[PDB]
């Protein structure tokens, strides 16, 4: 029934702290993938030397978000910089966050990897029990909903690589049909444990080259990179700024392919792309 627009955006991406850095790199055609002893080591276990890494990861303005200095060191850095970008995003669209306090506004987060969580749950008698209020996946949204006072749906979705886009779909749909007047769509991925990459490499999907040769014949695999990003959706009759309008969106699911589960079914993807165009 109602019209849905993208009113706010922000994120932190590989070798870029804010979206104006990110852009200078997109235009300047600068490879944001690097060769660093930054997350882990030069080339542990043979893993490719290349990763798209966030500049800093430890930064966070804890007082403003009201978190006891202790209860903050036991916060998953995704959630830390999520709480920041989604503020940086709301105000990006000319809205004062407070105007939304108490709204039927909602939060959808695309998150697949909660590494920080496991890290701070080993120590069996060193372990602070409130790390879980700061790591348990549900908090990637529940705690974003908490601080901004968004009394509408608070939800995390996991669908591997898809997720964040499907979060952005899920929210658009909620707004569209009454439920909400606006939403926080977020995506998060931070690369902390190398074991993760190691699994990927053993499935071959990891590019030794350490790069996402996008359409070039020599495509080995992809090159994992991290980011926290967020956008603000809203109904047009409420957006002080509009980057674009959502015309449609939907998702399906590669049936049962004979060639295995990892195999991208283009015949199904083809279907999904039609469902949203020509006649419909």
């Amino acid at each position: 029934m109602e019209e849905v627009v993208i009113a706010g955006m922000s994120g932190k991406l590989p070798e870029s702290e804010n979206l104006e850095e990110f852009w200078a790199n997109l235009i300047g055609g600068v490879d944001m993938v690097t060769a660093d002893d930054r997350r882990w080591k030069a080339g542990l276990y043979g893993l490719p030397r290349r990763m798209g890494k966030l500049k800093d990861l430890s930064r966070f303005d804890a007082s403003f978000f009201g978190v006891h200095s202790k209860q903050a060191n036991t916060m998953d850095p995704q959630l830390r910089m999520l709480l920041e970008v989604t503020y940086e995003a709301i105000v990006d669209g000319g809205i004062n966050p407070a105007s939304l306090r108490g709204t039927s506004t909602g939060v959808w987060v695309g998150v697949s990897s909660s590494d920080a969580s496991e890290a701070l749950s080993r120590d069996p008698e060193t372990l602070v029990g409130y790390s879980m209020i700061g790591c348990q996946r549900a908090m990637m949204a529940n705690r974003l909903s908490f601080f901004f006072d968004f009394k509408g749906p608070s939800i995390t979705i996991d669908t591997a690589c898809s997720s964040s886009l499907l979060a952005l779909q899920s929210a658009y749909q909620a707004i569209r049909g009454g439920e909400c007047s606006a939403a926080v769509v977020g995506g998060l991925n931070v690369l902390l444990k190398p074991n993760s990459s190691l699994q990927f490499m053993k499935l071959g999907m990891l590019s030794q080259d350490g790069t996402c040769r996008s359409f070039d014949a020599e495509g080995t695999g992809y090159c994992r990179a991290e980011a926290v990003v967020a956008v603000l959706l809203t109904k047009k009759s409420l957006a002080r700024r509009v980057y674009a309008t959502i015309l449609n969106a939907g998702t399906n699911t590669d049936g049962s392919k004979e060639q295995g589960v990892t195999f991208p079914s283009g015949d199904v993807q083809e279907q999904l792309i039609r469902s949203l165009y020509a006649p419909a």
Partner: protein, 70 residues
């Protein structure tokens, strides 16, 4: 301004049940509970009590034993 705890790649395991290794960190600034140590001054330096290593080790034993010192 203030930079916070980012669980390092080192943190995660190569695998282990590891109840038998312990690292102890000692602060001697006047605030620390282990400030009592500054009274083990010798020749003008504050040297960790030779006796202390025994205590550390001993603690360590009972840890691995699921028990307390006493």
């Amino acid at each position: 301004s203030q930079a916070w705890d980012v669980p390092s790649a080192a943190d995660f395991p190569s695998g282990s049940s590891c109840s038998s290794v312990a690292v102890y960190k000692f602060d001697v600034s006047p605030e620390s509970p282990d400030h009592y140590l500054v009274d083990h001054c010798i020749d003008g330096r504050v040297l960790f009590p030779g006796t202390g290593y025994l205590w550390l080790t001993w603690k360590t034993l009972a840890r691995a034993l699921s028990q307390n010192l006493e």
